[PDB]
Amino acid sequence: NHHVDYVIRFNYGDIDTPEAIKKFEVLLLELSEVGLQTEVRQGDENSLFVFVRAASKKKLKRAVYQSRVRDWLYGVRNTEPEPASSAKPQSEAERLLVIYHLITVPKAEGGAGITPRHGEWKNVDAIFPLHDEETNRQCMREWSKKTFLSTEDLDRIRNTFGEHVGFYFAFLQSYFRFLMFPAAFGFSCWLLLGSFSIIYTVVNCLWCIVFIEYWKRQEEDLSCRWQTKGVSAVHEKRAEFKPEKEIRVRGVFPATKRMYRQLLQVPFALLAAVALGAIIATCFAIEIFISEVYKGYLVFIPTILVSALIPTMSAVLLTVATKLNDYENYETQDAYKVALTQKIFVVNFITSYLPIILTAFVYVPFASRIVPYLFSINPDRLRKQVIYFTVTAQIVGFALETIVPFVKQEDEARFLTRVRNEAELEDYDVTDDLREMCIQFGYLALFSPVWPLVPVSFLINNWVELRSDFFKICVECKRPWPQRADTIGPWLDSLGFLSWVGSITSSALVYMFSNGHEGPNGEPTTIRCWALLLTIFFSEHLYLIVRYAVRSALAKLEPPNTRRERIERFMMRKRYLDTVLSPTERFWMRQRGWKESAEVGLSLIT
Amino acid sequence: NHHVDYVIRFNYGDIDTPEAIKKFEVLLLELSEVGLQTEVRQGDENSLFVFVRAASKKKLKRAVYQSRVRDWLYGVRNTEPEPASSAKPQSEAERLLVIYHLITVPKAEGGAGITPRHGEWKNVDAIFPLHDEETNRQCMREWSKKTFLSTEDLDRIRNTFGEHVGFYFAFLQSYFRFLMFPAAFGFSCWLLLGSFSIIYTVVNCLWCIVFIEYWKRQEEDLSCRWQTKGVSAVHEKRAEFKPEKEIRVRGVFPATKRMYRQLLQVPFALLAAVALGAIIATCFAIEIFISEVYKGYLVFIPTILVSALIPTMSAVLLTVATKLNDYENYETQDAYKVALTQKIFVVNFITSYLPIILTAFVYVPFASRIVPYLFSINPDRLRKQVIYFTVTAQIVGFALETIVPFVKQEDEARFLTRVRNEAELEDYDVTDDLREMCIQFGYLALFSPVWPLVPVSFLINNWVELRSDFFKICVECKRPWPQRADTIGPWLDSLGFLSWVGSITSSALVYMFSNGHEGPNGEPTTIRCWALLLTIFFSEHLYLIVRYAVRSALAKLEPPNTRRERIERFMMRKRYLDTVLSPTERFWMRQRGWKESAEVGLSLIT
Ligand SMILES: [Ca+2]
Ligand SMILES: [Ca+2]
Ligand SMILES: [Ca+2]
Ligand SMILES: [Ca+2]
Predict the structure, then answer these.
(1) How many CA atoms, within 13 angstroms, populate the side-chain half-sphere of residue B240?
(2) Smallest CA–CA separation between B555 and chain A, in Å?
(3) What totals of helices (H) and strands (E) does chain A contain, helices first?
């Protein structure tokens, strides 16, 4: 890579020439005044990117010791900072993270001011590091053959690509690994019993409880292991944040006003729910009427209708959620990303689980009681849609995930072109992959009693998807900068909610389908709503009781890295304490020493 | 008090004379070898108590600096220990707590070995401090007149009687204070509307949610204020603990074996539930048949039956719970007390809320459908039992709390008799008073839609009960030793569970009684169990949604003491850091300084 850390794509297309060269000179002054060596090279037809390297080894050592000092002070490291003359960077992640903080974190603390495209420049499109292609191809061809990734492999996806990708890859490993028990139980139940089986439903809800509690425990242990536990204290501030007052330099904003702006989440959620429910239910009723009332060239209208109407409405809701998320201030980038993710999860929940719920609950149980207003319903509609969403939708999702973007794409002559064709790749966001895994866990927690080969299909697809996501990161994207994290984000409570409703939906399914597969064949006159709500009541409360039992069991087992990170915070204070910090009386005149008190005791006992 | 800190009642009644004097000499040796001045005086007819004072001011200063060092090291204090020559004890609580640690915490760390009555002595009945009667009477007559206790008053009940009593008194103050909104709303609803009113039920569930979340916030703030946040790390070990192995000196026990012994909680809970349910339901059916089927001298059998059969069964269940709580090891005293409290809360729940539930749910809705097997039921049975349990049971509880134990009870001549008549008082346990307040909150959260003057009665009784509990502590008991805590214990999650079921029970009540007070008059043929379970379903899920909203709102508002205790843990580390700890290169040979890079930039832009 010729020691090049970062590439800063300065643009000059839409900006006139003297303003562009003034912006360029002010960009290159703050890079030399922060300790970074710059080398400008010709970019695209209308761009000009500047390479960035730490200027000297002593400047890099002084800049990486003052980045270990800061997160030791803010309670992340819990052990003393190594001295600066012996403080070499541990890996590529620490070096690239220090260089990115020197580039982006503003001039109040000591870094440069470069915020990409937002506030003063509006020209620097991206600040991307370069790939380590030999190590990437070695890791790809090394663990394209192993059945399970080791902790050394997870530490290599920590040392490259940072910790925010390493937490996702450890989550995917600990999710493919824990899929083996419901995979074996689902194969056993689909071979032995039929679908809608009670022991498979209880086993599946117990497995979701156990997996969620074990991954909360493993997240705490892994954030203690990777020295990134309290990384919320050193989160990167943002320049879009507009403060009210200034109390000494941080620019505070009253959090109650942000709560009152956060209460717009409920009308946005109601609008998104009503609009997406109207579109999906209208498409579903159109498909039902056209396909089973009134043809082979006329069955294809509602599928093209959702394929050309759902992503447009979802992009409109994404725009409205972004415009509302800029209204609330959110001084850090992590709070903004978590708020945007919690906003789009409602759209993702409705878009992902509304067809299976109308077909499973509104379609199978009523249908005839409706169709005359517009029956001998198709009994395999629910099984066919679960089979579709689990197998064929995952096949086409893997297709449009990694095959379609691959088909879509002197001495420095090869390097200046490999950076140029790495400049056009896609910026990698790990929330999309966490979204895919969480929607998949939602399918497995909600509609697994229909067709219990769903965990088997998810096991095979997860083993393919781990390697495919690593191939996408190393090949089809720019390198993500080493972002740190402690959890996977709001996806933890998303997974808890997903399983939470799964405990209601699967129990309602195994109640109302315990008469066959056709379940409540059309018109519902048999289903007894006094027996449909009692099983939901008792199953949800047994779910909550067993979940409380498992969380109270797993809380009392301290993991080794947490038990080693609450001991070093005693050892550091013990080392601090050794390095520095160096009438009435006539009642007590009778018995002086402890021998005469024993004499009065023996004299009073005898 | 003539500077006397503690009184250690050595017994010699059942022990023969040479063994008693050997135990006495070994008791008095370890007191002089730990730094405490002893003065033995004649006790009761068959006891002999030894007074204990710190021997010298320098020894007390060295013993109180090494007790600030320890909880600074274990992460409780978060600020540097003051030097020992200027480390005077802050109040009576710190001095008496240091003297109690020197008396009781065993010889591995530096204290003496005196465990009361357990392991080697089996004679020292109690180690009680002496009352500060002038300050106690001054505080009693000072805040027997004020409407609300100030934070200085709460800090005085912290400085005397420690922090475990101060947390309860702050809880009772913050519970009497937050009773004013449901008191005013219940008076407004009982004057304007009738009983079983929907807006009063929604307001009451919202008030329970808000009060529980605010008291969790205030508990965190108060444990940060009183410098006792992480006091779980310095909990007092116990001598009943029997360890498996010894790894360097703590005596570890495998926690999975304690989990497997903790799984006996479910058969004990089933046994207690079935037995107490059988006794209470048999008494209730006997009372119903005798009082309303078949007399004035014959109505009094079932009341004497519970008054002579419920406390005997509860004492049997207390004995079984103690024998099971000694089976599980529980190395600390706080874990043992929390486990015993969580065991007796099931007995307290069933004994406290089973008559109102059978009368409200089993009696009002069926009754005739039952009585022929043994109707025009009495409509005011539920209102009369709620009125009884809220008003008259609280009056007789205040009576048997403080009036009956008061009627039941040379130069050193007055002092040796005031200690002698303080030796016979009752050892004060704050879990009984927290149990009374939590059972009262359970009544208010479960059965307030019946007769909505229940929060008004609870407001008056709580203002009386705060002063009466302080009178009981200062007058009718020995002084409790200054035990530290951070929460009130498991009563927090007890209160959450209490309100949790209240959201089901009150909604079922206001469904099935929205036809009058008689509700489902006898035989149930009107109540529609498809409408009884939908309101329970929707009300419980709206309860959980609003509770999640309130906890997510109150989590984002940092209290001032927590925001000052996460800043001093930056300041201490910042003070530590200042007191101590002092081919490839041909690509980077084109442009040396940032001026020539700007020259290449202008040459490439132009
Ligand atoms: Ca996929
Ligand atoms: Ca993926
Ligand atoms: Ca009382
Ligand atoms: Ca009391």
Answers:
(1) 18
(2) 11
(3) 24, 4
B606 and A CB contact within 8 Å: yes
Ligand 4 center from residue B469 Cα (angstroms): 5
What's the DSSP call for residue A522? S
- On whether the CB atoms of residues B327 and B240 are closer than 8 A, the answer is no
Binding-site annotation, residues of A for Ca(2+) = 401, 433, 436, 465, 469
Which residue of A83, A570, A582 is in closest CB contact with B74? A570
Residue of B nearest to A81 (CA): B581
Q: Are A433 and A168 in contact, with CB atoms under 8 Å apart?
A: yes
Q: How many residues does chain B have?
A: 606
CA separation for the pair B138, A6 (Å, rounded): 72
Can you say whether the dihedral through the CA atoms of B308, B313, B316, B317 is positive or negative? negative
Taking each helix axis from N to C terminus, what angle separates A198-225 and A529-554, rounded to the nearest 10 degrees? 30
User: Rounded to an integer, what distance in angstroms lies between the CA atom of residue B432 and that of residue B318?
Assistant: 14
Residue of B175, B170, B95, B154 whose CA lies nearest to B130: B95
Q: What are phi and psi of B53, to 5 degrees?
A: -135, 150
Contacts with A77 from chain B: Cβ below 8 Å: none
In this complex, is the C-beta atom of B550 within 8 Å of any C-beta atom belonging to chain A?
no
CA A526 to chain centroid: 44
Is B155 among the annotated ligand-binding positions?
A: no
Residues of A in contact with B70 (CB under 8 A): none
Chain B, nearest residue to A533 by Cα: B533
Residue B437 domain boundaries? 1-606
- Tokens read off for A244: 């009210």
Task: Count CB atoms within 10 A of the CB of residue B334.
Answer: 18
Which tokens is B543 given?
């309860």
Cα dist from B330 to A142, A548, A551, B250, whole Å: 48, 21, 19, 13
Q: Exposed e or buried b for every residue in B556-576, given b needs 16+ CB within 10 A?
A: eeebebbeebbeebeebbeeb
Would you mind telling me the total number of residues written for chain A in this entry? Answer: 606
The angstrom resolution of this structure is: 3.5
What strands, in cross-sheet order, belong to the sheet with A6-11?
A36-40, A47-54, A6-11, A127-129
**What spacing in Å lies between the alpha carbon of B407 and ligand 3's midpoint?**
18
* Closest approach of A298 to chain B, Cα-based (Å): 41
Write the residue in A586, A590, A605 that is nearest to B21 by C-beta.
A605
Neighbours of ion ligand 3 (CB under 5 A): B 397-398, 465
Report residue B495: phi and psi, to 5°: -70, -35
Question: Half-sphere exposure (CA, 13 Å, Cβ side) for B122?
Answer: 9
Dist. CA A373–CA A288, nearest whole Å: 13
CA distance B386 to A375: 54
For residue B407, which amino acid is it? V
Nearest Cα of chain B lies from the Cα of A42 at a distance, in angstroms, of 7
Please tell me the number of Cα atoms within 13 Å of A168 on its side-chain side: 26
Whole-number Å distance, alpha carbon B456 to ligand 3 midpoint, is 14
CB contact under 8 A, A570 and B50: no
Q: Which residues of B touch A21 (CB under 8 A)?
A: 598, 601-602, 605
What is the sign, positive or negative, of the torsion defined by CA atoms of A378, A381, A383, A387? positive
Nearest to A356 by CA among A465, A444, A453: A444
CA B139 to mean position of chain CA atoms: 23
Beta bridge partners of residue B52, listed in sequence order: B6, B38
What is the distance between the alpha carbons of residues B597 and B480, in angstroms, rounded to a whole number? 77
How many domains does chain B divide into?
1
Q: Do B69 and A31 touch (CB under 8 A)?
A: no
Is residue A496 less than 8 Å (CB to CB) from chain B?
no
Quote the DSSP letter at residue A479: P
Residue B62 near residue B43, CB atoms below 8 Å: no
Residue in B368, B394, B364, B397 with CA at minimum distance from that of residue B381: B364
